[PDB]
Amino acid sequence: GIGKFLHAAKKFXKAFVAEIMNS
Amino acid sequence: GIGKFLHAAKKFXKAFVAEIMNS
Numbered sequence: 719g720i721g722k723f724l725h726a727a728k729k730f731x732k733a734f735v736a737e738i739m740n741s
Numbered sequence: 742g743i744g745k746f747l748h749a750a751k752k753f754x755k756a757f758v759a760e761i762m763n764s
Contacts, residue, residue: 719760726749726756733749740742 719763723753723756723760726753730746730749730753733746737742737746
């Protein structure tokens with residue numbers, strides 16, 4: 719049940735961290 | 742960056758809501 723949600727949460731971790739580190 | 746982050750954030754809104762309404 720939770721796999722799509724967990725994956726999406728991890729991608730939303732990665733994207734935020736990429737945004738802040740972009741500069 | 743910001744566009745990818747906003748997209749991922751909203752996909753993670755959608756994915757949560759899809760799963761949680763099963764409860």
